[PDB]
Each structure stands twice: as structure tokens, then as C-alpha cells.
Amino acid sequence: MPLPKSLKYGDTIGIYSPSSPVTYTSPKRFERAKSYLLQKGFHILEGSLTGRYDYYRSGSIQERAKELNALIRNPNVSCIMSTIGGMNSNSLLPYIDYDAFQNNPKIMIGYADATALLLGIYAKTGIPTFYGPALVPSFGEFEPFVDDTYKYFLETLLHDQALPYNIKQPLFWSDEFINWEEKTKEKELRPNNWISVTNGQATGRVIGGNLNTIQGIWGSPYMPCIQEGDILFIEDSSKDAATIERSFSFLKINGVFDKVSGIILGKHEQFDDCGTNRKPYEILLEVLQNQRIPLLADFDCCATHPMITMPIGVQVKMDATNKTIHILEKWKI
Amino acid sequence: SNAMPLPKSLKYGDTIGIYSPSSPVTYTSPKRFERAKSYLLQKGFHILEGSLTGRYDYYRSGSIQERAKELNALIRNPNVSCIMSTIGGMNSNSLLPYIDYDAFQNNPKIMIGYADATALLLGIYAKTGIPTFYGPALVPSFGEFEPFVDDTYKYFLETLLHDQALPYNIKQPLFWSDEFINWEEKTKEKELRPNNWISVTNGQATGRVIGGNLNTIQGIWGSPYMPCIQEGDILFIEDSSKDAATIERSFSFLKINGVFDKVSGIILGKHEQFDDCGTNRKPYEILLEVLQNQRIPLLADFDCCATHPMITMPIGVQVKMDATNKTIHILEKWKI
């Protein structure tokens, strides 16, 4: 695999808005997020659609692709980070300069709808991409949680890490639906646990991201093929039991559970259980119908805070029983 | 093409089996459910109520296995002529591994519904080759008050009961509505809005029609239950009660999958209660942005969707679409 250079203090992070126009609609949180990273020591290069507004999106298909491609082609930018998701990143896929990326690999990071681009870049170039912070949701978060998301970002992207790289559980989390633009109270600290839903271990290439979003790219050249022995990493956020049953069944009928060696399931921010009192993993277990696949749930790589930064497309070992995740293969220089 | 297995035409007095593959409407909307059944019974059909009728499991009628059992009992019943969903939802695709495709193949029936039931319409077609029908679901379609229910019923009989010489012309309804009123109880008359189809991009296409509810297709894409789209097919798609962001994603999903390189034309349903997100854009405008510089004949605002009234459309048979003149003809038999 070609690999991106590690992030360094003094580097420039390019930001782009491939879907929702958050830099227009949530300017306080946007400015707070920029200032946070500037203070840490990174410059921010604002993509061409920053401050622009086209209702549910930042701009036309072409204009969004141009915004991203300008960052891809800029040798001064070491990391390209989505501002936020939405629904419409998959529109850009035919128009991205994959060749320019492959020729000068950089860190591509974000989450949620940005999955479309993370996976498409990986599919087209073979360069690992990163399920991790987007500027506004992740680095616009108030203290305390922002600081733990930031710690995890440095660990994956900037620190010199020896292999194997151990991914550790945070002590506390939150999904509270408060404090978006302005802070009104402290978010409750939720004690954490990862869940040993189905015991066992697996080692394989990790593939996945936001499940809802995967259904917008599935079957295309931009969806990496799932191979025998891969580890599936999936999360959904702010959806409901009916939506995720459809998604889990989508994977089942596509044979994904006959291929993968294990499953890492993210927490589900603000899950709506439709009155059932069922957890997301229980719905998945129904869909799996007693097929014994190791399953570790409530992983902190999703819309809940704080967020881990996870490489995608590299070898991983998971132990659902003992609740560990290690990265086995280098993901950066 | 060669003659193929087909389901028997509907007859007066036939039994319609109803099942709930997703939302538990028979429990949550009991007045519309009772009105719909009464409407068909009053026409002289019998209704066989599947095993989950009146049951409730929150967002669904029952477990995955319970729902498969419900539908299979109808598939396996030689006295049922037509199997009709009560309503959609989100979760029909869960049943797909568990359906008795061999029993269906042994005794093909008219399979009809819409919206989430696309997963089963397309999965039965994919597995068996038997045409299925994008058309009425019991409670939304046949629980509609007069006058629109009568137009829906007329189209249902024209396609499933009456003998039709080929080419069979699909006539445009004269009036339509998507008003978000009169679900359980009637409060006023719906507006009889003058209807039209839309010539979005001129031209003609002839090919096998494939499609249904686009949102639902994304829950079965890539599986053995999704029929493969072939060069020259006509794509039929509709979405209902969604928004501009959602449909852009679905359109781009088709684009990146190469679908628009294959199909000869596109039929786009009306979009009930579309949320334009403030853009003032029509669904077809969003689609055409996705299409970019690729010219494809496109007929839009077709009445085979959640708006009233509803046309019954066979899937998996040859059709001629004329987007210039706003016509649709069915060219191959779909029933015997």
C-alpha cells in the first residue's frame, strides 16, 4: 500500500463540505472548531464552498467535486477533512481526481456521509483512509469531550506508533443532544463499556464506516469488495430500529456475514428503539439467526463523543471477549 | 420472446391473501384497514387474513421468522389467487432468505404491492422469473375514500382481471391528489387536481421494465434478490414522502452503479408530499443534474406511486415508453 505522511504540527488541514452547508448554518461551532485546531498548531485551508449555501447542500455536484479536487491537488495540504456529512457525498465520486491522490497520498478523514468518499478513495487507490473527526461536529464540541477526541486524533495521525497499535476505550462518553452552537450546561458523563455480544477473536482487513451511507455506494466501483476474512466495522447514528433492521438485512442478503470474520459495531447516537427496548446489537443478532460471528459493540467510533480515529483498509485484530482492538499493519509513514 | 410461466388472471370471487411484511397497519389503523377489506369484499372478493393480522410489534408486525411464516402460508395455499401487502414500511427485505420461492414457482400467483414491498416484488421476480406487480397495497390503496379508490380499482381490474390485447395502453388518470388528509376518518373532499405526465426528455424506448420504490431498492441491491439490470431495460422508479437530499443520494447511487449507461429510458413516478428543502426543485430536476451530459428519454409524474389514484404495473415484461407523446404500452403478456 502507498501510505500518507503522518500529520505534523505546522501542517495545513484542508476542509471541504461535500454535503450539508454547515459553515453557513452553524457559524459559531465552525469558528470554534477552526480556533481549536489553530491553537493546537495546525493551519486551516478553507475550501472554495466555505460559507456558501445551497439549501440542503453546499453547492452543485460539479462545484463540490472541484472543492475537494483543489485540496487533493494542493501539495501544501497534508490532511483533508470534511466539515460535516449529510447525504450527498456520493454524488462527487465520478469526478474526483483519484490519480492525483494516488500520486501524492494525503490523510483523508471524516465520518458519517463522508464514508462514501473514504471508501471510494480506498477502493480506487488502495491508500488507507480514516474514519474519524469531521471539523464542525467533532472539533466544535465543547470541553471536556473535544479534548479526548483530539487525543485520539493525534494518536492515529501524528504520533510515531509502533505495531501493534492498541485502540483503547474512553472512560466516559456522551450522545446528549445539547450544546451545538452555544453551551447551556455540562453534558452528563456516561460511564463506558464495550460490549462482548458474541465471544471470539478475528484478524483481517477492516472495512466499513457508516452503514446507512454504504447503501448509497454499494455495488459500485467505489465500494471496496468485501473479502473472506475481512472485519466489518459499521455504525449508524440518529436512526431508528426499522432503519437499522433494513440495513442489517441488506448486509445479510448480500452474503456479507458469510464472508466476514468479525464485526465491530459503533454506538448508536440517540437511537430510537421505536418502543421496543431493544438495543441495536439485538436487532443485528436477530438478523444473524445464530450464525456465530464474533461481535464487539458500542465501539467509540461514531457520532457519540469522544471519537476514535480509525484506519480503514488495514489489518486489524479484534477480540470481542476481552474487548480489544489492535491495528497490525502500518497506515502512515 | 418465448412463452413463459405466468400467473392466472384474477377472477371475480377469488381469494386475496393479505400479509404485513413490515409496519403493523392492521393494528395501528384499524378503521382504514376495515374500510379497505370491506371495499374489496363488497366487490365480491374473499380476503384471507394472514397470521399477523391484528398483531403488533411496535415498528413491525412480528419477528423476521413470523413474517416469513405469514407470507409463506399464503404462497403455499392453492386457494389464494393474489397475495397483497397490507402496507409497506422498511423491513420486507428481512424476509428474503426465508421465502418459499420453490412453492411460488410451483404455483405462481399475482404478487402485488408497492413501496417497501418492492423488496419482495423484485425478489420473487429475481428468483422465479414470474412477473410481479407494482400496484395497490390493501390499506393505503383500497382504504382510500371515494372517489379516487374507484379509479385505483378500475386500473387494478383492467390489468389483473380483464383480457387485454397487446399492445396494452396505460391510460393517464384525469385527476390526482397527494393530500395528507383523510387517513382513518374523512374530514373533507380531496382536491381533484387536473393530471398530466411530464415529457422531461424527449424520445422513445422499448425494453423490459424493472424497478419500483428506489429507496427500497437500496436495501436489496447487489443481492440475489435484485434482478440484474440489463442493457436496454426501462427503469421505473418512484420515491414518496422523501426529500431532495435523500433522492439526490439515490439518484447518484444509480449513476455510480452504471445503471444509466444501461437503460434505454426512465419512467419516474410522482413524488407524494415531496420536501424540496427550500430549493423549489422538482425531483426530475435533481435527477437531471445527476445525469449531467447523458441524454436519456424520461417520462415523469407517472401515477404508479403513493399518490392517488394508482396504476397497476407489471414488472419484468417488455414495455414501450414514449416520453415525447407521454405514452406507455405493455407489449408482452403478464397473466393467462
**Min distance A14 CA to chain B CA atoms (Å):** 24
Q: Please spell the DSSP secondary structure of B57-80, one letter per residue.
A: BTTBSS-HHHHHHHHHHHHT-TTE
B314 touches B125 (CB < 8 A):
no
Does the distance separating the beta carbons of A87 and B249 come in below 8 Å? Answer: yes
Pairing of strands B265-269, B168-169: unpaired
Domain A1-164 has CATH 3.40.50.10740: yes
Q: Do domains A1-164 and A165-333 have the same CATH topology?
A: no
What's the CA gap between A147 and A300, in Å, rounded?
14
3-state secondary structure of B40: helix
Nearest Cα of chain A lies from the Cα of B115 at a distance, in angstroms, of: 14
* A contact set with B (CB within 8 A): 19, 54-57, 60-61, 86-88, 90-91, 93-94, 215-222, 240-243, 245-247, 249-250, 252-255, 274-276, 286-287, 289
Query: Please, what's the largest Cα pairwise distance for chain B?
Result: 52
- What is the CA B118 to chain-centroid distance, rounded? 6
For residue A25, list chain B residues with Cβ-Cβ distance below 8 A.
none
Nearest residue, CB atoms, B248 vs list A88, A219, A276: A88
Contact call for residues B315 and B229 (beta carbons, < 8 A): no
| Cβ separation B220–A91 shorter than 8 A | no
Q: Which residues pair with B328 in a beta bridge?
A: B321
Which residues contact residue B69 at a Cβ distance below 8 angstroms, ignoring those fewer than 6 apart? Answer: B51
Contacts of A66 (CB under 8 A, 6+ apart): A48
Those residues with Cβ within 8 angstroms of residue B293's Cβ, 6 or more apart along the chain or in another chain: none
Residue of B nearest to A277 (CA): B58
The angle at the Cα of A144, spanning A140 to A145, to the nearest 5 degrees, equals 60
- Domain ranges in chain A? 1-164, 165-333
Return the bridge partners of B234, or none.
B209, B265
* CB count in 10 Å sphere of residue A270: 13
Contacts of A255 in chain B (CB under 8 A): 223
| Grid coordinates given for A313 | 483498509
Distance from CA of A290 to the nearest CA of B (A): 13
Q: With an 8 Å Cβ cutoff, are A216 and B218 in contact? A: yes
Give the number of C-alpha atoms closer than 13 A to the C-alpha of residue B68, restricted to the C-beta side.
13
Stretch (H or E) spanning B291? helix B283-291
SS3 assignment, position A309 = coil
Q: State the Cα–Cα distance between residues A191 and B187, nearest whole angstrom.
A: 51
Element (H, E) at B103: helix B101-106
Give CA–CA dist B294/B297, Å, rounded: 10
Contacts of residue A240 in chain B, CB cutoff 8 Å?
Answer: 59
Residues of chain A positioned with their CB less than 8 A from the CB of B221: 215, 218-219, 250
Q: Could you tell me how many CB contacts below 8 A there are between chain A and chain B? A: 119
A310, three cell numbers: 480509525
CA angle B272, B274, B279 (to 5 degrees): 160
Method: X-ray
| Cα(A22)–Cα(A210) distance, integer angstroms | 19
Q: With respect to CATH, is domain A165-333 assigned 3.30.565.10? A: no
Spatial neighbors of A324 by CB under 8 A, at least 6 apart, are: A166, A167, A317, A318
Name residues whose C-beta falls within 8 Å of residue A277's C-beta, 6 or more positions apart in sequence: none
- CB within 8 Å of A270: residues ≥ 6 apart: A175, A177, A237, A238
Q: Does domain B1-167 have CATH number 3.90.78.10?
A: no
The answer to whether the CB atoms of B59 and A240 lie below 8 A apart is: yes
Burial tier of B188 (Cβ tally within 10 Å: 0-12, 13-18, 19+) = exposed
Q: Is the link from the previous residue into B97 a cis peptide, with omega within 30 of 0?
A: no
Q: What single-letter DSSP state applies at residue A174?
A: B
Q: Which residues on adjacent β-strands are paired with residue B322?
A: B204, B327
Name which of A22, A212, A246 to mutate to probe chain B: the one with the most chain B Cβ atoms within 10 A of its Cβ.
Answer: A246
Name the residue among A327, A329, A316, A266 with its Cα closest to residue A296: A266
Chain B residues touching A88 at Cβ < 8 A: 245, 248-249, 252
The domain defined by B168-336 carries CATH number 3.50.30.30: no
| Shortest CA distance from A91: residue in chain B | B252
Cβ–Cβ of B277/A94 closer than 8 Å?
A: no
Give residue ranges of B with CB < 8 Å to any A CB: 22, 57-60, 63-64, 89-91, 93-94, 96-97, 218-225, 243-246, 248-250, 252-253, 255-258, 277-279, 289-290, 292
C-alpha dihedral (B39, B42, B44, B45), degrees to nearest 10: 30
Cα separation of B223 and B92, whole Å? 14
Cα A126–Cα A130–Cα A131 angle in degrees, nearest 5: 130
- Range list of H helices, A162-225: 211-214
Tell me if B29 sits within 8 A of B53, measured CB to CB.
no
Element (H, E) at B255: helix B244-256
* Cβ pair A245:B279 closer than 8 A: no
Q: Report strand pairing: B132-134 vs B110-113.
A: parallel
SS3 state at B90: coil
Determine, for residues A88 and B257 on separate chains, whether the beta-carbon distance falls below 8 Å.
no
> Pairing between strand A172-173 and A295-299?
unpaired
